[PDB]
Chain A
């Protein structure tokens, strides 16, 4: 019977979305940083919040959080979003193209490009799932 009430969960949310920059990782320091950043009018409550906040910081140090996204996470993601491979995945020497799309390209007169290579279609038209 240790399900967290919306009050303590929401306190953790507002603390990590408004005063995250001042919190520390240690629980025994966490209730102290909790009482420094906001006011907890009780003790059991502040250990509740400190324990959950330790849980959130452990979760973020593990990796992503599905429901939580802050400006700091936004900038760290845009730091991690810029992965550019040395070779583009699109620039390739030979790419396969069916005769029909060769005709489509030739209708625009771009069939002269050398990177296209014919791939013959499948033997039959076995492309539908059986009915039943």
Chain B
């Protein structure tokens, strides 16, 4: 994934004795993918989901649809 989390721009600012050369790098946000960040979940992190609560059956309760 590290192939697609870098943005880079370059500029320079002027002193008389020398130039200050400014490279700007930014890491890309996975969370605001905007369809560019990978839709797929992060490889290492096993994206788990919150379990759902329900009543543990004690007496049979039957519904008709």
* Residues of chain A having any CB pair with chain B under 8 Å: 7, 11, 14-15, 18-19, 34, 37-42, 45, 49
Nearest CB of chain A from residue B63's CB, rounded to whole Å? 23
Within B31-64, the residues touching A (CB, 8 Å) are 40-49, 51
The chain B residue with its CB closest to the CB of A39 is B47
The A/B interface has a contact count, at CB < 8 Å, of 33
Add 13 more A-B contacts to A11-B46, A15-B46, A19-B48 (CB < 8 A).
A14-B48, A19-B51, A37-B48, A38-B46, A39-B41, A41-B41, A41-B42, A41-B43, A42-B43, A45-B43, A45-B44, A45-B46, A49-B46
Ranked nearest first, the 6 interchain pairs of A and B with the lowest CB-CB distance are A38-B48, A11-B46, A39-B47, A41-B43, A38-B46, A7-B44
Q: Which residues of B contact A11 (CB under 8 A)?
A: 46
Q: Which residues of B contact A38 (CB under 8 A)?
A: 46-49
Q: Which residues of A contact B47 (CB under 8 A)?
A: 38-39, 41
Q: Which residues of A contact B44 (CB under 8 A)?
A: 7, 45
Are B49 and A41 touching (Cβ within 8 A)?
no
Q: Which residues of B contact A15 (CB under 8 A)?
A: 46, 48
Choose among B42, B43, B45, B48 the residue that contacts A18 (Cβ–Cβ < 8 A).
B48
Nearest CB of chain A from residue B8's CB, rounded to whole Å? 27
Are B46 and A40 touching (Cβ within 8 A)?
yes
User: In whole angstroms, how far apart are the Cα atoms of A45 and B46 in the complex?
Assistant: 9
Are B46 and A18 touching (Cβ within 8 A)?
no
Q: Which residues of B contact A18 (CB under 8 A)?
A: 48, 51
Q: Which residues of B contact A40 (CB under 8 A)?
A: 46
